């Protein structure tokens, strides 16, 4: 999969989409639909479907929803307030977690200002907490902005 601070973005396009194989697969731990209840998806047509992908903790799946707050929805991935799609989530302990700790899945924990909806930020500048210029070096009130 893809990190949480640089999510992916696939633009599904002209095709025959069958959201029933999704809806009834029973392998998903969370399948919420917001603009439109799930059973009526296989009876409507749009212009574009986007699919974003990433990996988070287990109890941060409640911040992937319109109108939430927290380190994920504030500055990692923000959903607009009139969302239309659906959110799907499933546990993946056996694939992504490895003995000794899988330190390849990072997230951003400091930013100047919360994200605009569907905005993305992969920069890696030293977060300047204190007025003292960080000069690009760590220290008190000068923090690296990514945690794992």
């Amino acid at each position, epitope marked *: 999969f893809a990190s949480v601070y640089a999510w992916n973005r696939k633009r599904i396009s002209n095709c025959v989409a069958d959201y029933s194989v999704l809806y009834n697969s029973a392998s998903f731990s969370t399948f919420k639909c917001y603009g439109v209840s799930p059973t009526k998806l296989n009876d409507l047509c749009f212009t574009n479907v986007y699919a974003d992908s990433f990996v988070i903790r287990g109890d941060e799946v409640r911040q992937i929803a319109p109108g939430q707050t927290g380190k994920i929805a504030d500055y990692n991935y923000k959903l607009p307030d009139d969302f239309t799609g659906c959110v799907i989530a499933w546990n993946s302990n056996n694939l992504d977690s490895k003995v000794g700790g899988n330190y390849n899945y990072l997230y951003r*924990l*400091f*930013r100047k200002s919360n994200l605009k909806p569907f905005e993305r930020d992969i920069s890696t500048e030293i977060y*300047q*907490a*204190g*007025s*003292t210029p960080c000069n690009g070096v*760590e*220290g*008190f*009130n000068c*923090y*690296f902005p990514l*945690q*794992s």
Partner: antibody
Amino acid sequence: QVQLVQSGAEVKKPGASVKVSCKASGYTFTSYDINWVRQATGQGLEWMGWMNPNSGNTGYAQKFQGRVTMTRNTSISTAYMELSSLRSEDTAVYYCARYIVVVPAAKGFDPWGQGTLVTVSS
Amino acid sequence: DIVMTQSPDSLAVSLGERATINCKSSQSVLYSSNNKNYLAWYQQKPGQPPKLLIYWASTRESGVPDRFSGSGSGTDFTLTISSLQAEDVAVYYCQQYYSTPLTFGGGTKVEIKR
């Protein structure tokens, strides 16, 4: 959970060396700077912040220099402190704290070690 | 450099009173629009590790009831606990922030009536 566990309430003789441990839990560890303070019998505190999650250059308080050494282990996230050449008036209690931060600027120390004892005297 | 001289000491006054603990040195307003402050208030019970009280100087108490209440300015400020009650008897230090070290000293006890 948000915890800090110290150990090593002990006694030393002057002109010696000591290592003191702080065990952490309930956090990513390498993400918040560890800061130790001194405290005599009914007095104030000192020792400026230092050390960081990754590598960390580490700082000092400029009257404690040379005797002070800060070593940790990425095996569980346990910060330590090595003092040397004790002079039998550094007998005090020694603390740990996580120094938590939040968007704007960190706000005081997150937790607070349980403290420890070092008693120097022949 | 920045010395946090606290004036009052042993405010052993009848519970409920309104203590006023002042201290200052060498302002730390801290630019960056973040015009807030730079120093927390602390509470250390005797025979106990310290705890956290008002920070940013900005009343920002955490799991802490309202009677403990801060204030702030550029150089000078005060903690000012209201309606004090039994078990607030402690030692109350200050901070410095970007400075380096710390500095503070205060406490209370009782007074009685007789």
